[model samples]
Every structure is written in structure tokens, then in C-alpha cells.
Target: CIAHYGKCDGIINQCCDPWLCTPPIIGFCL
Candidate 1:
């Protein structure tokens, strides 16, 4: 699972634990 500044760019609804996807378009999990 994506977490802690992990790349989430072009992705949605995918993150670790309490999710936080940042920067939107080029998102990174925070």
C-alpha cells in the first residue's frame, strides 16, 4: 500500500492506513 510520500500520481482511492494523497494530479501519499 502506498504511504508516507509514496507516489500516487495518476492513481486514486489507494493509500496506506489513514490515507492522504497530495498534489492531486501528480499525487503522493502523505
Candidate 2:
């Protein structure tokens, strides 16, 4: 799934984070 960040688009670097797990997307919590 793709999450668009309005007009000033930004990339959510989930490369370090696993695609899906118990602790999904650390950046989201950070």
C-alpha cells in the first residue's frame, strides 16, 4: 500500500522496518 503525503510528497523509508510484523513500521511510532 502507498501512503501519499499531500502536495509536498515525502518518502517513508520503511527499508529498515519489516513489511509486516508485531512491531510494524517503527518510524510510525517514532
TM-score of each: 0.39, 0.13
Per-residue accuracy of model 2 over 1-30 as CA lDDT, tens digit each: 333321211254433322322223333312
Note the clash tally of each candidate. 0, 0
Look at candidate 1 and give me any clashing residue pairs. none
Query: Model 2, 19: alpha-carbon shift in Å?
Result: 5.3
Q: What is the model-wide C-alpha lDDT for candidate 1?
A: 0.65
RMSD of 1: 2.3
Candidate 1 per-residue C-alpha lDDT over 1-30 given as tens digits, one digit per residue, 9 for 90 to 100 = 666677876557566645667765676676
Give model 2's TM-score versus the native structure: 0.13
Residue 24 in model 1: lDDT: 57
User: lDDT for every model?
Assistant: 0.65, 0.29
Candidate 2 colliding pairs: none
